[PDB]
Design a protein around this ligand. Structure first.
Ligand code: CL
Ligand code: CL
Ligand code: NA
Length: 130
């Protein structure tokens, strides 16, 4: 499913992402935008280390979900990576909450650092009623 901007914003708020571990909703929006373009079925193989990024938040198989083919990987979210490819983003959101519970927080995603950190991210939520 490819979410429309404001539709996603409202969904994330209802799932309790606004201010989770200090991360504003606009930051989560900026992340989803640059990671997948709001596409829940996005997958990305990383030939360099044999891991794959899954779904709307592009969560990595080496640490967060189990896909069976990633060497020396763990499953901190206790999910099959398949769960991160559903139209319903409930499982992806619960896993994202798990990710930011680690010391790095939102910084765990390098794309957030490159395109969201220290920027005016208001634009991602303006006019959405959240
Ligand atoms: Cl699962
Ligand atoms: Cl599994
Ligand atoms: Na894994």
């Amino acid at each position: 499913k490819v979410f429309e901007r404001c539709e996603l914003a409202r969904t994330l708020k209802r799932l309790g992402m606004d201010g989770f571990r200090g991360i504003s909703l606009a930051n989560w929006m900026c992340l989803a935008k640059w990671e997948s373009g709001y596409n829940t079925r996005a997958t990305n193989y990383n030939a360099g280390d044999r891991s794959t990024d899954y779904g709307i938040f592009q969560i990595n198989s080496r640490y967060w979900c189990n896909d069976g083919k990633t060497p020396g990987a763990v499953n901190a979210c206790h999910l099959s990576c398949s769960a991160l490819l559903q139209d319903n983003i409930a499982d992806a959101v619960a896993c994202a909450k798990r990710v930011v519970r680690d010391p790095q927080g939102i910084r765990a995603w390098v794309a957030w650092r490159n395109r969201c950190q220290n920027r005016d991210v208001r634009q991602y939520v303006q006019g959405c009623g959240v």
